[PDB]
């Protein structure tokens, strides 16, 4: 995925453990997250390169199957929305984890059999006050709310 190499104003304190996801506070591991400035927190992978004739680490934004985590996500994306996490959702293209950072996953847009979140969809709804719009399989569950009060 997109890389980017460390800066010095970079102050990683949170390492994730790949197949067990324990979180430990820590400077330095395999699977690291980092928060450029200005943007959101990422999962990222430390990955060997060779820059300006040297060999190096970089941080890549990589895929992470977390289902051997066995912990839901707060939050995830895929297509262009971000919706809540509620029991029943498929895995998306990306997870967010209440600790404070996104995990590029091994999802799609399908949220759930028959139902893609995609901005160009037929269904309006919200998720505790969050709009989102669904595309529908051709009865079918719609997985959130009126927009209606
Ligand atoms: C999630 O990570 C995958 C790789 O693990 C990313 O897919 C690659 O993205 C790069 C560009 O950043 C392409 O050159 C590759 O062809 C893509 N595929 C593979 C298999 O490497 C993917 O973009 C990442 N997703 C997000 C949302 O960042
Ligand atoms: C992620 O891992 C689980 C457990 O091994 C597996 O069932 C699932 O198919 C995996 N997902 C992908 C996209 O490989
Ligand atoms: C979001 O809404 C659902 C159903 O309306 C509810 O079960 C859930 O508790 C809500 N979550 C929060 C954080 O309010």
């Given at each position: 995925?997109?890389?980017?190499?460390?800066?010095?104003?970079?102050?990683?304190?949170?390492?994730?453990?790949?197949?067990?996801?324990?979180?430990?506070?820590?400077?330095?591991?395999?699977?690291?997250?980092?928060?450029?400035?200005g943007?959101?927190?990422?999962?990222?992978?430390?990955?060997?390169?060779?820059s300006?004739?040297?060999?190096?680490?970089?941080?890549?934004?990589?895929?992470?199957?977390?289902?051997?985590?066995?912990?839901?996500?707060?939050?995830?994306?895929?297509?262009?929305?971000?919706?809540?996490?509620?029991?029943?959702?498929?895995?998306?293209?990306?997870?967010?984890?209440?600790?404070?950072?996104?995990?590029?996953?091994?999802?799609?847009?399908?949220?759930?059999?028959?139902?893609?979140?995609?901005?160009?969809?037929?269904?309006?709804?919200?998720?505790?006050?969050?709009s989102?719009?669904?595309?529908l399989?051709?009865?079918?569950?719609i997985?959130?709310?009126?927009?209606?009060?």
């Open positions: 995925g997109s890389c980017h190499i460390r800066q010095d104003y970079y102050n990683i304190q949170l390492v994730v453990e790949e197949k067990t996801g324990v979180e430990k506070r820590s400077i330095m591991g395999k699977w690291s997250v980092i928060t450029r400035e943007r959101e927190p990422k999962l990222m992978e430390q990955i060997n390169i060779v300006n004739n040297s060999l190096s680490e970089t941080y890549c934004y990589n895929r992470l199957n977390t289902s051997s985590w066995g912990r839901q996500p707060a939050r995830q994306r895929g297509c262009g929305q971000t919706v809540p996490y509620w029991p029943g959702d498929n895995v998306l293209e990306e997870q967010y984890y209440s600790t404070g950072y996104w995990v590029n996953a091994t999802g799609g847009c399908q949220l759930r059999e028959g139902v893609w979140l995609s901005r160009k969809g037929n269904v309006q709804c919200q998720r505790n006050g969050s989102l719009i669904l595309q399989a051709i009865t079918m569950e997985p959130c709310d009126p927009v209606e009060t």
